């Protein structure tokens, strides 16, 4: 019961199942295409603080995947490495054949800890995590992915690092990592470009920790 | 091709008072609309993009809103140099059409 | 028959896909280099219509996956080709 789009010299139509269109010729299987599109193209927020609120954990439901033949370049991809407070892993290792998404502009790598209630992390809106040419219902550990959806039809990076605490819950906190001992408090009003600009002025000017302590920066509210 | 319609053609306003301009799309433009300020002798200056975000260097007195086929530009209080022709542009179709330009007057 | 009801739409697509001794795995490119690229614009409303289609096909796809046992499904389009033929010449 999965719909197919049909591309005409008019517009994009959705193929029926009850109505047979005699002129909708299919000459080969090469005219059928699976396309992975990103959610960012619909205006969903992409900052880390808001993104992680769309994900959550559950048990009793197995993971599954489907393939793509083509897809979009992502401006914002994510890569998670989350551990439980006791040091154990939250996310499963990716299985053979799963590789990261090939075309990301900024990768938001989040490392940290938090409660992990289930077996797997699932998307709450039912969107898929997009891996190289495979969409998945779950997040795999250490693998870069984009969020998105898959269409079927008839045809005729800069790496930004963050630390996280309380990753799997509602009230969580994040830091932007400049150096091993240098961090900036993260806010939802920051864009990837903003963070890169802060990394250049702080690092270049030497406003970094010299002692063994952690230097934590807070952006002026204005 | 999407025809963009602006109104009023001319909008006189006393200095210190605000003013608003309208722009209408023939087909929905989702948010994909921009406003530019045109003065004699210069390339148009981008003010607002994605129907509401200020371009770098644009004063807080300029603000916009809208979606679909109904868009607007508001100046909260006109200052000197806010008297210009204001154009709307849609970037949702590829003819990249423009409105007519409204003439904001003193 | 597709009405895009999303808050906003990126009107264009920046896409990638996979299309002498170059063909030999030993001498050919590493995986990061096997992709092609290009842009498409919203010709006649196609891109925003396509984004809405992908948003609508999601429910059917998730229910489908719940029912099946394959760990990885590569066969959705082969099934479509078969049904196409059965509906016309059954």
């Amino acid at each position, epitope marked *: 019961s999965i719909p197919l789009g049909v591309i005409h010299n008019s517009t994009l139509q959705v193929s029926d199942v009850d109505k047979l269109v005699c002129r909708d010729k299919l000459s080969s299987t090469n005219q059928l295409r699976s396309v992975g599109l990103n959610l960012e193209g619909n205006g969903v927020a992409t900052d880390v603080p808001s993104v992680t609120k769309r994900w959550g954990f559950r048990s009793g439901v197995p993971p599954k995947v489907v393939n793509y033949e083509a897809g979009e370049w992502a401006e914002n991809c994510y890569n998670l490495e989350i551990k439980k407070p006791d040091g154990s892993e939250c996310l499963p290792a990716a299985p053979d054949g799963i590789r990261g998404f090939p075309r990301c502009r900024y990768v938001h790598k989040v490392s940290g800890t938090g409660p992990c209630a289930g077996d797997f992390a699932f998307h709450k809106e039912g969107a898929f995590f997009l891996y190289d040419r495979l969409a998945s219902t779950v997040i795999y550990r250490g693998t870069t992915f984009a969020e998105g959806v898959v269409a079927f039809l008839i045809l005729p990076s800069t790496t930004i690092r963050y630390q996280a605490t309380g990753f799997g819950t509602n009230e969580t906190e994040y830091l932007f990592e400049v150096d091993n001992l240098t961090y900036v408090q993260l806010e939802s009003r920051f864009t990837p470009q903003f963070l890169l600009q802060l990394n250049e002025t702080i690092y270049a000017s030497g406003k970094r920790s010299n002692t063994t302590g952690k230097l934590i920066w807070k952006v002026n509210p204005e | 091709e999407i025809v963009m319609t602006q109104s009023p053609a001319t909008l006189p306003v006393s200095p210190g008072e605000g003013a608003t301009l309208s722009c209408r799309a023939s087909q929905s433009v989702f948010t994909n609309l*921009a406003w530019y300020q045109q003065k004699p002798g210069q390339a148009p200056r*981008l003010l607002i993009y994605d129907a509401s975000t200020r371009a770098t260097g644009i004063p807080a007195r300029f603000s916009g809103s809208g979606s679909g086929t109904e868009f607007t530009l508001t100046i909260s209080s006109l200052q000197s140099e806010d008297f210009a022709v204001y154009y709307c542009q849609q*970037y949702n179709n590829w003819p990249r059409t423009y409105g*007519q330009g409204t003439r904001v007057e003193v | 028959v597709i009405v895009n009801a999303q808050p906003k739409c990126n009107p264009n697509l*920046h896409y990638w896909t996979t299309q002498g001794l170059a063909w030999i795995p030993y001498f050919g490119p590493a995986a990061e280099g096997i992709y092609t690229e290009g842009l498409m614009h919203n010709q006649d409303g196609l891109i925003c219509g396509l984004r809405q289609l992908a948003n609508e096909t999601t429910q059917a796809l998730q229910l489908f996956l719940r029912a099946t046992t394959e760990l990885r499904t590569f066969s959705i389009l082969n099934r479509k080709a078969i049904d196409f033929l059965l509906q016309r010449w059954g």
Partner: nanobody
Amino acid sequence: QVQLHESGPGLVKPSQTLSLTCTVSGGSINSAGYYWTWIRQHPGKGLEWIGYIDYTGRTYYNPSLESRVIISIDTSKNHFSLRLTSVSAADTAVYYCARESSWVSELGRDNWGQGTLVTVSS
């Protein structure tokens, strides 16, 4: 960031081909996700978009000028150009060079050049 500078003959005669070249600096042409475009001023009137060339060299033209316009590009020198054939007095305008982006964050942010005035007369 990327500076755009138009140059050309300034004055051309009717039935001649107009050639305007835009120098790209502070960036490069094969930048991934950008369109290189041209716009015509029509003095006293609003703007008319002319066309684009992709980062891959692919083109599209405004149908009103499709038969009269060639847009091309040279990535070894970082220039692109507009070739408008069969000019007439009606084509007098300031021509502008601009860059557009497919990236979501920058989707509504244009980069405009200074603009070059071309007069067509006998």
